[PDB]
Design a protein around this ligand. Structure first.
Ligand SMILES: Nc1ncnc2c1ncn2[C@@H]1O[C@H](CO)[C@@H](O)[C@H]1O
Ligand SMILES: Nc1ncnc2c1ncn2[C@@H]1O[C@H](CO)[C@@H](O)[C@H]1O
Lengths: 156, 154
């Protein structure tokens, strides 16, 4: 026939009132339902607001910036934010705890995963869980950087 | 029981009607089929926990943290039945250019403790409210049973 999320909601609210499951479960199911309507667009941090690291910055300046912002992962850029070279994970810096003089950012930089703004959060979540990924870079329909999106932001 | 099955097949029907996609269906099914789960069911058991000893040197701590590659670690005193707090790996960066100043306890956060028989559903809720990611699971006498993470229950 034909249906809406509304019909599913009624169906579930019904089961709860018939005590098939409890209030907390009901809230969890409705949250999943609401989540299914969302896209990367809805959870991303926009380009002009991302905290990034410059390709050629010193270990001292990188480390201070990482501590200051307290993030765990950072896009690393070349000329500007439309040239993302990779992702640095804050804790990969600890490899240089005792030999900072040997710091080589390219030695610890990981490749960036790219996604479009229209991608469903359910697909993104599945891919984050599979790839053991935590951050993706969001690309606009022309190849430019639209922003970034994180696992911790979407599981909120 | 007949209540649960029924809710399920109507969820599948809503899927075949384009209400939501297969990925969502999976999430919904999981939240149901597994709504009776407890912390006990998702925990990393005591022997498999990767922990830090309170008095280990910055060298030993740092190598272990890099090797196991977790982002969070219980910190213990005498043994695993004495958890003193949780260390976030990135907080070690505080000592990058002054490793001689290392004081593990200055970067140690309070541990949260939960019972084995707590529902995952309730735990999930408390993790989200508390902006918490790890809990230490304890038995009926306060002994450590294991640890449990947001990652593992979602
Ligand atoms: N490298 C980054 N640049 C801009 N915002 C971030 C970055 N990493 C995490 N965030 C956001 O800040 C919060 C805490 O890090 C996260 O929930 C996320 O929304
Ligand atoms: N301190 C720790 N000791 C043992 N396993 C952990 C620790 N922190 C996260 N994990 C588990 O390692 C896996 C990868 O993060 C997850 O299943 C997570 O639960």
């Amino acid at each position: 026939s034909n249906a809406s999320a509304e019909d599913v909601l009624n169906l579930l609210r019904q089961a709860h009132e018939q005590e098939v499951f409890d209030a907390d479960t009901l809230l969890r199911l409705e949250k999943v339902l609401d989540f299914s309507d969302l896209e990367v667009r809805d959870a991303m941090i926009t380009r002009s607001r991302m905290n990034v690291l410059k390709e050629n910055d010193s270990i001292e300046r990188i480390t201070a910036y990482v501590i200051d912002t307290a993030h765990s992962r950072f896009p690393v850029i070349g000329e500007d934010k439309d040239e993302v070279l990779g992702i640095l994970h804050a804790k990969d810096l600890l490899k240089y705890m005792f030999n900072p003089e040997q710091f080589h950012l390219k030695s610890i930089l990981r490749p960036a995963v790219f996604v479009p703004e229209g991608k469903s959060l359910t697909a993104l979540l599945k891919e984050f869980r599979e790839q053991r990924n935590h951050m993706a870079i969001v690309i606009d329909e022309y190849g430019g950087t639209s922003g970034l999106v994180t696992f911790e932001d979407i599981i909120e």
